[PDB]
Design a protein around this ligand. Sequence first.
Ligand SMILES: OCCN(CCO)CCO
Ligand SMILES: [Ca+2]
Length: 230
Amino acid sequence: SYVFADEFDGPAGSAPSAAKWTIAKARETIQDPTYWEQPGRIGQYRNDRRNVFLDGKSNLVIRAAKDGDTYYSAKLASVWEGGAGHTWEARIKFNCLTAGAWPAFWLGNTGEGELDIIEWYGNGSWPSATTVHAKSNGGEWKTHNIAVDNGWHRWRTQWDAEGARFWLDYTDGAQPYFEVAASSLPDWPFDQPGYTMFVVLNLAVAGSGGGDPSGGTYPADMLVDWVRVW
Ligand SMILES: OCCN(CCO)CCO
Ligand SMILES: [Ca+2]
């Protein structure tokens, strides 16, 4: 009994469900861009079957690849949104841990609050990590470094009014590798009545976290076998 799920079944080369996902048509605009955030260096997003498609073997493929002078990739945001008191999990394979790449699985909200379940940074500086943000600019957060490899893994979070918890490859009764108490973040928005969040799966190229892709190996793929919330 899932409140939201996508098993990404369907024929090779087809698009993910338009009923479940919004596919980004552009990379967000960066207000005061660092070098790799500059228009013309930042990677782009588009709804193109070369960059986001089902492999016909039960996986969503998000692919970053150079087209002309621009790196293109993809971002999906769930149309559905879910509130407190659920468990959220995706099975993911990062075939894209290369210079310039910046994959992420996260729960978003356009007002405040963000649960970055896992991000890996290709810029050669930032360690991969799980992060909880509160506050409008996300300027109040707790973060936890965790290593990412290219194997299949399940990334899980639970959150409610009292806190947020994270697991890697969850097994029965395992302790979260990271948890955050509401009381540890003064502006904790997750306890607001009716507060909900959408799911995001994306593979960015360049920008701050991605950095220089010139030495990286492209095409680079992020595979998603499923996303489930219950
Ligand atoms: O975190 C980034 C790692 N990345 C940066 C290289 O300069 C190398 C990946 O193989
Ligand atoms: Ca699947």
